[PDB]
Amino acid sequence: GFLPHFQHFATQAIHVGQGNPTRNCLEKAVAALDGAKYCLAFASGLAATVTITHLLKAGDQIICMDDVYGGTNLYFRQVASEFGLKISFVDCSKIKLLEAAITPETKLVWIETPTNPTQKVIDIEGCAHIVHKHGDIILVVDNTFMSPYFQRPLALGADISMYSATKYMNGHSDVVMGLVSVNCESLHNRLRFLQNSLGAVPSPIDCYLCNRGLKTLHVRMEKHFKNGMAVAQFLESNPWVEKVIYPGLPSHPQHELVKRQCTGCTGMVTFYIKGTLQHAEIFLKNLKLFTLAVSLGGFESLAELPAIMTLGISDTLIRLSVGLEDEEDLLEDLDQALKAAHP
Amino acid sequence: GFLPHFQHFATQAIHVGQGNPTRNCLEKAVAALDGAKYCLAFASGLAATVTITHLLKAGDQIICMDDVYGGTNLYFRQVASEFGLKISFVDCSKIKLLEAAITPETKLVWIETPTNPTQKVIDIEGCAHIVHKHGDIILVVDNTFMSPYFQRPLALGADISMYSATKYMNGHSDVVMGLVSVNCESLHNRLRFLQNSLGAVPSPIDCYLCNRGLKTLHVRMEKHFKNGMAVAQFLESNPWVEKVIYPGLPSHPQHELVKRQCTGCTGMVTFYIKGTLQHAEIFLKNLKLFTLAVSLGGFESLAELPAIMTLGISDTLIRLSVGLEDEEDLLEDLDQALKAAHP
Amino acid sequence: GFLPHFQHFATQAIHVGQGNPTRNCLEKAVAALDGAKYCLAFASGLAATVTITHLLKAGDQIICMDDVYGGTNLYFRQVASEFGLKISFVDCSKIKLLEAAITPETKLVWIETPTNPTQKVIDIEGCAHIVHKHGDIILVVDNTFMSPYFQRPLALGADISMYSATKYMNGHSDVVMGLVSVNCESLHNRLRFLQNSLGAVPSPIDCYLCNRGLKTLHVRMEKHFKNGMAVAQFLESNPWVEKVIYPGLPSHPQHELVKRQCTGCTGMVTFYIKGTLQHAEIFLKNLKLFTLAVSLGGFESLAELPAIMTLGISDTLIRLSVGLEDEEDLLEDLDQALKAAHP
Amino acid sequence: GFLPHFQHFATQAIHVGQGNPTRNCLEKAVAALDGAKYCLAFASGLAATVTITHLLKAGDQIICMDDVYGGTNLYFRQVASEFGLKISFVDCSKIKLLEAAITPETKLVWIETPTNPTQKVIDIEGCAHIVHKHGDIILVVDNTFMSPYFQRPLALGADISMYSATKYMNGHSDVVMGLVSVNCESLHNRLRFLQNSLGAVPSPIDCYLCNRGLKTLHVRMEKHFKNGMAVAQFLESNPWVEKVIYPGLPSHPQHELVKRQCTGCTGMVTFYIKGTLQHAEIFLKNLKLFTLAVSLGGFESLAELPAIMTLGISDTLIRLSVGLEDEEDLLEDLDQALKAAHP
Fold this sequence. Notes:
- Four copies of one chain form a homotetramer.
- Chain A is an alpha/beta fold.
- Chain A folds into two domains: 1-214, Aspartate Aminotransferase, domain 2; 215-343, Aspartate Aminotransferase, domain 1.
- Chain A is built from 13 helices and twelve strands.
- Chains A, B, C, D: One of its GO terms (molecular function) is calmodulin binding.
């Protein structure tokens, strides 16, 4: 059994909110969903990330969750380099390694769960209890790969929960957002000053369309979960799949952590096709419903071979972003394409 | 057990469609959801209704489902009067009355299910075989009060399935539509000619935003059903409620028909408060989450006393349009307000 | 000297307006611009036309301005045929012919000025004094080819001024409208009843975006006029142009009427290239700035050979819709392409 | 005589442009209008300003045009303080003071023309040769108070031309932008890196709606100029006005520079009412067409008493943002209100 879904969530998304009034209402809304007293809207998740780092001073160290196969490590390096900050990347799925890597100059720790695309799950409050045991170190959790609907990092010990809205989310509505939620009273003040004085803020239209999208997040994510679960279960029992990686499955090496840390899972399913690279690539060309794309989220089910679209990652590793179509149609498409790769 | 949900529905809404290209894609999409070969988009449900009547000639008779407590009878009278047509209103929930009322001048039969607000359920395929047993008579079903997701009138024997989109629907997006689906190819041709020659058509923006809304109709209506079900069940077992009218409940006099005719029910719940008019009106002003409105649909739960907001209808009859908030929050609001009316 | 521009026009468009509140504000706004007490918004110009005809009774006759090379004659025939109306087409640029064609059954007269694409100008109040001398006959002027900014048919004697907004107007904003303005107190009432009872009405979004576009109509049309004038003048003095048709030029056979009937002209310029069909078609392929299109209006300058894109019309007749680009750039493109057709 | 309007401007805005395709097209378009090889879009003018400062290193000095009565000096102080930069404010309308204030640590010079609200005009090319005479110093001109249509700072010697789009601009369309144009290719490269690595960028929706607004900028600004000119001339010859400040008037102390530096002026007119503060405030409440607001731009004419709405500024100084209404209507409103303040 997972964590029970957060109370008043859907009610809050729909009713909460109903200077910059549109942004103010959005921040008021999101803060509720994040189980927070405060929230700040920025022009993008990246801009949100930069602002958070501006809380630090030259010489201070950041420790980041090591994103091996994603590209995000670069972006953090460029920011740290730009503002004279020390940075280090650690596999925080191994809680020892994090604790071992902390210095007295460590002031910020950044965490993504689950990781993309191999989906390792990081114990948030495990990390939080390690981070807060000595010194004052801000713990930030990138809450993008789950939603506020499935994961609440603030109620888990993190000091900051950042959610990045991309142009692909909510049926490809071209909304881009960096949403920073915090329960600390000093943190909100400093961030708020940074927000208004640096101007990295969304437009009123962005704020409106983002707020609008939130109102259907729960029913959307549920279907993502429902379909994802189905797709994962099907793939795992399929004779042409080596193995499957999906946090909602008991087969997942961190499944027990997931159930106590989250209320559900997204439509992001990773699996390993049997055979070599060229079965994986035949498979991809036989999909008639799944669309080939590197993006994440959306109403349409997406498929990706990260080994070719971006030591190297597995050529048999495939990452699906399961959409909102009929479960059967998805299963049938996968079944057909898998069969096409193994005559 | 209800009818199994229509296959490929969610897939179709999301993928089908992806002169007037935007309208063409919308009509192509909706036709799939309506289980139809053809669909036509008009500027409004009313304009769609007028167009359908233009299939007839002066002297031809229409027989309409008698909408007692709704206002719609007027609109049909005005149309019939305008174009020299005879019209008569019959309680078609009693199939007896319909067959008795058929004339050789009868050319069109109009049907709404369920009715508003007392929610009578009309046997569509019962009516369809009665209508098609002699003469050439078009049967039209107003499929607005259910969705194409819950009810498919074309697969039930009707010749025409009209869906009227209002601006309150899909989170109050200001989209207005008349959508006419038909499986007959002579019918489609005449309607298509009428459509392009009379100009009562939506704008490209309307078509786009309508098409966009369709892609989440299934997950939205499901939540409406889930919450509606919860609300209905709660009310019925509540000591301050005389009785409850909800097609999804076994207590409903047409429940068996519903399960055979539909795949589910909407968030429209009608019940009778105990006591007189003034408990009903105390109840309404103690609601803190439900919003007082005469409109139907939306993300927000609505409450209405039709006896005051429009032989007279019951002073104790209340009609709720249950939204997408958290089931618990709704139940508590209703529970609180009911007790507030009965010290 | 033309008629002085209508007073308070720009002020009205911007400030006037700042049931169906958005439509109500739009109708209030447009009525001011049309110099009217009343205005009604329909889903399209065609729907507006149909509604106007519904003022008539079976057997009543319509007399329409004969649109030879446009297609619109068909649409009127289909409507008249649909509702048992008698119809006749007369060259109303010859005022005698109109007066000669009036019957006691004549109840409606329809007029477009200027015509498309040969741009004959009809004397509105000449027609109005002929129409109103006996019987009660509604005179309607299709005020689409001019704007309310350049032409005010109600202040000229017409009983009804209809303006049709197409998806191409106001920088291709997908707004479609039928706007009917009237000063008569019986006419407005009947039309208003027809409007609300037949449902051929625009959406709130349509109404908003239409209202928004109006606020810049004056500065837009001015540039259309300014550029059009330049283009016309250039073409007429160009050695590869047989002759030019533009109401703003003294060379135009109805120029004197135009100046007393209008406050300016649009960007619609018609001219005859020297030589045969194949110089005209070479010319078209050498345009690098002008875009080949059959549509009318928009920010981009458009070119059309109606003889090929739709007794026959001239193969050397070309109709330009001059946009809002720099006058020189337009002139240079035309000069270059003309020179390319005559080595 | 002013500078001749920039060639191909209107053509470019309309046609140029027709990764992040929407932003790329916008930047491609704006660069043309700015007479630039390159342009970069940021989430806001303020974010654009911060990015530009990030070209500098701790210890480097900025010299800013001293914005006395505006608030902008604060924002620069906060930025400089945040990133360890020295800053100084100099009246650069007096070229004397600027040259005297240049240090070897001086790396950036910031300039606004005209100033708000007293409208000092700064000699851009005067400042540019002073700045570029020794050392490597970036000159930036805030080109917001004029448009790219009236002022081209890059063609005048500046290295960077920044245009800040506010949500009041283009008929209050909620678009917010920072647009940075540069002709240096080293400058563009560093800025481009900063742009993509810091994430302070607009959304696709922002870029689209901004790009859309550009297409009518020329015809809009012209009307602003035309009306502004009229308003200024009227006020100056009005017996209840002490004096008037408008760059388009020969009475303006920098008028000759203006004509050499610009192709026209905006709708921003500053004047001094006769009498004391209380005539100025009576005047404001008697305006029936002008709207009281502190914002700048829009379709509607605005009035502001900066002495009360924000050594102190004049109690009799009033700043108007003249809109797009009819010149006469504006003149009558001003005439009426002025007489209302002087019985």
